[PDB]
């Protein structure tokens, strides 16, 4: 059944432990486009306060009540998986705001727009060699994020030279990491990884740092926004973090893709929400839409929004539009590579005197 406006259902998580990612998110939809190809948009925004449930419930009304020619979301991995899981059985296109383990039976219909672990890693640990950390402690939460991270340590950050000597798990609701701070005192590593984000992964940060752990700590680009120093406060200098490139839109070479986006979308968050209130999420929501802005005019030349024909449409355009310049990196998605993304979607950062800082 036809319709004038495109239909977007979004789901991103605005209360509860990961309300720092879904907050942002929401807000970044103020920026950006309301029409595209003389089409206006509706976007439906639901909150799903990061539980699997309860974004399966918003995917499932944005299939059968508001026929959505596109769903976005959500905020955190849990979700995210609930979510792309909905979108492949219903048949419709998806754009994660949050890493996703992409098997095969979530491959066709989904596209990621965060980093995908492996590159992020590569970053942090190359920091670690060129450092003279050899062994390595991780602590992350236990779930799908968590596991991303640990797996990669184990099969990206072994190969390169580093031993894992401590592995602790927390849930994203807990307020107390004693237990697994201490067992990762007693270990000793030279360095350790916290696998976390937004507001949660300021929490074994500053727990380390009141236990006596004086090593370095790395944190994961779902750690980068104001938030975290914030809360971390004293205990967030020195620490390494892989963020991607919308951190710092100023420090890029005039001819990057990511330049003109980032500028963009810092300028007007910043101005409604005050100086260096940039974040990674507000990045992901608002380059979903830069992946619109070039998919849906393609679509358009095939079928009319509301049909099963114009989200098979997107499904396609998804790969044969490339170089998708956006704030966060340059994307150009494949049949299997459902990421899409390069060197250019990341940089490294530390934290002086409570303000990100490049590593260069
Ligand atoms: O807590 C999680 O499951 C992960 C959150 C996350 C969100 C955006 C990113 O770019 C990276 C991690």
């Given at each position: 059944a036809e319709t004038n406006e495109i239909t977007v259902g979004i789901t991103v998580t605005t209360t509860g432990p990961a309300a720092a990612l879904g907050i942002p998110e929401r807000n970044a939809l103020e920026f950006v486009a309301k029409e595209i190809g003389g089409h206006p948009i509706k976007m439906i925004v639901l909150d799903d306060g990061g539980d699997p449930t309860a974004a399966t419930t918003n995917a499932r009304r944005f299939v059968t009540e508001s026929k959505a020619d596109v769903i976005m979301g959500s905020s955190v991995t849990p979700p995210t998986v609930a979510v792309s899981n909905v979108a492949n059985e219903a048949q419709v296109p998806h754009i994660a705001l949050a890493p996703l383990p992409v098997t095969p039976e979530r491959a066709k219909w989904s596209v990621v727009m965060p980093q995908p672990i492996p590159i992020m890693g590569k970053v942090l640990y190359e920091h670690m060699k060129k450092n003279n950390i050899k062994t390595v402690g991780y602590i992350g939460y236990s779930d799908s994020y968590g596991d991303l991270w640990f797996n990669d340590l184990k099969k990206q950050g072994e190969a390169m030279g580093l031993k894992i000597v401590a592995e602790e798990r927390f849930a994203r609701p807990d307020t107390s990491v004693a237990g697994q701070v201490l067992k990762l005192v007693a270990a000793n590593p030279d360095a350790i990884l916290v696998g976390a984000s937004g507001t949660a992964a300021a929490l074994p940060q500053t727990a380390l740092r009141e236990r006596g752990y004086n090593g370095l700590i790395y944190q994961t680009h779902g750690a980068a926004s104001m938030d975290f120093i914030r809360i971390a406060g004293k205990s967030a200098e020195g620490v390494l973090m892989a963020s991607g490139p919308v951190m710092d839109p100023?420090?890029?070479?005039?001819?990057?893709?990511?330049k003109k986006p980032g500028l963009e979308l810092n300028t007007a968050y910043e101005t409604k929400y005050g100086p260096n209130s940039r974040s990674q999420f507000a990045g992901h929501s608002f380059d979903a839409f830069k992946v619109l802005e070039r998919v849906i005019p393609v679509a358009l030349k095939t079928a009319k929004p509301g049909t099963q024909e114009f989200r098979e449409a997107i499904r396609k355009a998804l790969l044969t539009e490339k170089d998708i310049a956006a704030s966060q990196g340059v994307y150009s998605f494949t049949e299997t590579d459902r990421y899409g993304l390069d060197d250019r979607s990341r940089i490294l950062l530390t934290v002086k005197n409570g303000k990100y800082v490049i590593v260069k």
């Open positions: 100023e420090g890029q070479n005039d001819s990057a893709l990511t």
